[PDB]
Amino acid sequence: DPVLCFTQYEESSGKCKGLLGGGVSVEDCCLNTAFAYQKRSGGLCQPCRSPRWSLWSTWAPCSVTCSEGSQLRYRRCVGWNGQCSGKVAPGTLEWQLQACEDQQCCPEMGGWSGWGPWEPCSVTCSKGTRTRRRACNHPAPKCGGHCPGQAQESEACDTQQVCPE
Amino acid sequence: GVAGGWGPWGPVSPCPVTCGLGQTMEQRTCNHPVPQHGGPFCAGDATRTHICNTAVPCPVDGEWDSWGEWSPCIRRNMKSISCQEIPGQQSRGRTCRGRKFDGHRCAGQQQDIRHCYSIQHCPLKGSWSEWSTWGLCMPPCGPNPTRARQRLCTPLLPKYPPTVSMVEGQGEKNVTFWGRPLPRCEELQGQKLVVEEKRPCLHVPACKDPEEEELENLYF
Numbered sequence A: 001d002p003v004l005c006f007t008q009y010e011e012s013s014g015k016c017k018g019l020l021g022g023g024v025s026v027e028d029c030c031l032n033t034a035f036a037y038q039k040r041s042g043g044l045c046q047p048c049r050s051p052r053w054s055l056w057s058t059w060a061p062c063s064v065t066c067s068e069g070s071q072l073r074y075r076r077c078v079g080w081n082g083q084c085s086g087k088v089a090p091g092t093l094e095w096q097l098q099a100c101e102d103q104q105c106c107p108e109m110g111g112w113s114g115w116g117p118w119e120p121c122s123v124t125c126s127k128g129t130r131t132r133r134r135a136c137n138h139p140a141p142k143c144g145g146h147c148p149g150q151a152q153e154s155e156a157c158d159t160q161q162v163c164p165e
Numbered sequence B: 001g002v003a004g005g006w007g008p009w010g011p012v013s014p015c016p017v018t019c020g021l022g023q024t025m026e027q028r029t030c031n032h033p034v035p036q037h038g039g040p041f042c043a044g045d046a047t048r049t050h051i052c053n054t055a056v057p058c059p060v061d062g063e064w065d066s067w068g069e070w071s072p073c074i075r076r077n078m079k080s081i082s083c084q085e086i087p088g089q090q091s092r093g094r095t096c097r098g099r100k101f102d103g104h105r106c107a108g109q110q111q112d113i114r115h116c117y118s119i120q121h122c123p124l125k126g127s128w129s130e131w132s133t134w135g136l137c138m139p140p141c142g143p144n145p146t147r148a149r150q151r152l153c154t155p156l157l158p159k160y161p162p163t164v165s166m167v168e169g170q171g172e173k174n175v176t177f178w179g180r181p182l183p184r185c186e187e188l189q190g191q192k193l194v195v196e197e198k199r200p201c202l203h204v205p206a207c208k209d210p211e212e213e214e215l216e217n218l219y220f
């Protein structure tokens, strides 16, 4: 079965670099153990050396940003015609799951308090703005929480007074 | 406007590699009908490549295997030397795995030997160590992974000379302990050897292909 043959294998990247050609069987391409092959070009680049386990990748991000989570890292057996340690076929993946913690607390949103009384109208003649503010401390937020909505309603008011001409 | 044309192909380069696959190429020039005034130009390519196949494999050098297990600690002409001040010698072996096709042989010593004291199955006084670091989540990609840390009965090694002169070898060689002793310790939570506690791991992520997982999060 033909396969694309590459002249160099870049470790820690899992990529075939330096294309030589296709239409050549896997046996001929892997006569030099420093080569690598990729079938159908979709992926699955594999070195020609004896199968040996690759390196543990960096930890995947913690499954949740809150309290205790779980994160994974993979390791693939790379090689041709052979088995890794443990009677494992080339292309198989091993995993290690680990508990992680980004931060201790997590945002518990607070509740709105009683409304502050209506502030006086922003102007003494014609029409103005009537502001109404409250606070977000019933209860108070922790970590990174915030109250839903806004903390200052604003309406209009008519003073029913004419300005001097 | 004078049409460009190709000349003769140059000599093909010899197969540069002495093993496996290589590559050859030929070099021709557009010097036979040279294009004039820039009207037309010679078409095609000025360099064709071919793959030269040599059936001989390539020398793959031998890489050392991981160390085997330490041999039992024995003294010559004394049979068992357990739980006694008797210096033995234990060996450890490697395997030059992978040397093929005139590859360079493995460099070093395939046999490691150290002087030892035997402590196999000896009853000793013990003491409970502190809580170990929380282990991994196991089984990964399995039903309900569970972490686990453990306190255990740490044996108290007998105060024997760690530095002994060997009469046969005329050397002052170090001695280390080897074996599985049977430690004695007051019961802690109803266990005489190792008491552990398990906690389930939270928000377990599914195990998918590193490429497939990458394409899945990107696509949402």
Ligand SMILES: *[C@@H]1O[C@H](CO[C@H]2O[C@@H](C)[C@@H](O)[C@@H](O)[C@@H]2O)[C@@H](O[C@@H]2O[C@H](CO)[C@@H](O)[C@H](O)[C@H]2NC(C)=O)[C@H](O)[C@H]1NC(C)=O
Binding pocket: B113, B114, B115, B162, B172, B173, B174, B175
């Ligand atoms: C045990 O001894 C080593 C060195 O001596 C011996 O090593 C044995 C494995 C064996 O092969 C034997 O034939 C050989 O003589 C000590 O290593 C030394 O440690 C000190 C401090 O740790 C360093 O400063 C030295 O550089 C280092 N090497 C030498 C050559 O002295 C080792 O520490 C010792 N272990 C104990 C627990 O005492």
Ligand SMILES: *[C@@H]1O[C@@H](C)[C@@H](O)[C@@H](O[C@@H]2O[C@H](CO)[C@@H](O)[C@H](O)[C@H]2O)[C@@H]1O
Binding pocket: A064, A065, A066, A106, A107, A108, A109, A144
């Ligand atoms: C990661 O970062 C944290 C700061 C949070 O914003 C996380 O979002 C979620 O927030 C709610 C609180 O409303 C918690 O119940 C969730 O546990 C948490 O996932 C975010 O994922």
Ligand SMILES: *[C@@H]1O[C@@H](C)[C@@H](O)[C@@H](O[C@@H]2O[C@H](CO)[C@@H](O)[C@H](O)[C@H]2O)[C@@H]1O
Binding pocket: A123, A124, A125, A161, A162, A163, A164
């Ligand atoms: C309150 O009383 C009213 C009767 C006005 O006298 C106001 O002053 C007027 O305010 C507008 C803008 O606020 C200005 O254009 C006028 O110049 C000023 O007379 C007062 O604030």
Ligand SMILES: *[C@@H]1O[C@@H](C)[C@@H](O)[C@@H](O[C@@H]2O[C@H](CO)[C@@H](O)[C@H](O)[C@H]2O)[C@@H]1O
Binding pocket: A032, A034, B016, B017, B018, B019, B058, B059
């Ligand atoms: C020619 O003879 C062979 C028997 C090998 O000894 C060859 O060595 C190999 O040369 C190629 C490059 O030409 C390298 O890819 C290999 O790493 C090397 O083993 C020698 O050239």
Ligand SMILES: *[C@H]1O[C@H](CO)[C@@H](O)[C@H](O)[C@@H]1O
Binding pocket: A054, A055, A056, A075
């Ligand atoms: C991952 O695990 C250890 C290091 O943590 C080594 O055996 C090796 O680097 C592997 O890739």
Ligand SMILES: *[C@H]1O[C@H](CO)[C@@H](O)[C@H](O)[C@@H]1O
Binding pocket: A057, A058, A059, A060
């Ligand atoms: C996870 O573990 C450590 C950092 O916590 C490093 O080895 C690396 O960043 C890995 O992703």
Ligand SMILES: *[C@H]1O[C@H](CO)[C@@H](O)[C@H](O)[C@@H]1O
Binding pocket: A110, A111, A112, A147, A148, A149
């Ligand atoms: C304040 O605003 C409304 C109630 O007025 C709710 O979204 C919630 O109780 C918030 O604390």
Ligand SMILES: *[C@H]1O[C@H](CO)[C@@H](O)[C@H](O)[C@@H]1O
Binding pocket: A113, A114, A115
């Ligand atoms: C203030 O506004 C109304 C009452 O006017 C209610 O949503 C609530 O009592 C709030 O504190």
Ligand SMILES: *[C@H]1O[C@H](CO)[C@@H](O)[C@H](O)[C@@H]1O
Binding pocket: A116, A117, A118
């Ligand atoms: C403003 O509006 C009325 C009085 O106009 C009352 O509900 C309260 O004083 C509020 O602050």
Ligand SMILES: *[C@H]1O[C@H](CO)[C@@H](O)[C@H](O)[C@@H]1O
Binding pocket: B004, B005, B006, B007, B042, B043, B044
């Ligand atoms: C040179 O190359 C090929 C013939 O080898 C043609 O495309 C054409 O004759 C060009 O001049």
Ligand SMILES: *[C@H]1O[C@H](CO)[C@@H](O)[C@H](O)[C@@H]1O
Binding pocket: B007, B008, B009, B028
């Ligand atoms: C080079 O290649 C072939 C001979 O192999 C011919 O088409 C022609 O001689 C060209 O110059």
Ligand SMILES: *[C@H]1O[C@H](CO)[C@@H](O)[C@H](O)[C@@H]1O
Binding pocket: B065, B066, B067
């Ligand atoms: C055996 O000795 C150590 C590990 O104990 C390493 O140098 C290496 O793994 C070797 O095979």
Ligand SMILES: *[C@H]1O[C@H](CO)[C@@H](O)[C@H](O)[C@@H]1O
Binding pocket: B067, B068, B069, B070, B177, B178, B179
């Ligand atoms: C010999 O020494 C210890 C066991 O006592 C381990 O490091 C290992 O099994 C080695 O082969």
Ligand SMILES: *[C@H]1O[C@H](CO)[C@@H](O)[C@H](O)[C@@H]1O
Binding pocket: B126, B127, B128, B185, B186, B187, B188
């Ligand atoms: C076992 O180990 C020591 C005594 O040997 C103490 O830490 C405790 O009694 C524990 O049960």
Ligand SMILES: *[C@H]1O[C@H](CO)[C@@H](O)[C@H](O)[C@@H]1O
Binding pocket: B129, B130, B131, B132
């Ligand atoms: C384990 O538990 C706590 C720390 O988690 C301490 O009492 C001590 O380190 C024990 O070994």
Ligand SMILES: *[C@H]1O[C@H](CO)[C@@H](O)[C@H](O)[C@@H]1O
Binding pocket: A099, B132, B133, B134, B149
């Ligand atoms: C496991 O849990 C935390 C770290 O996640 C620490 O208390 C300690 O390292 C323990 O072994």
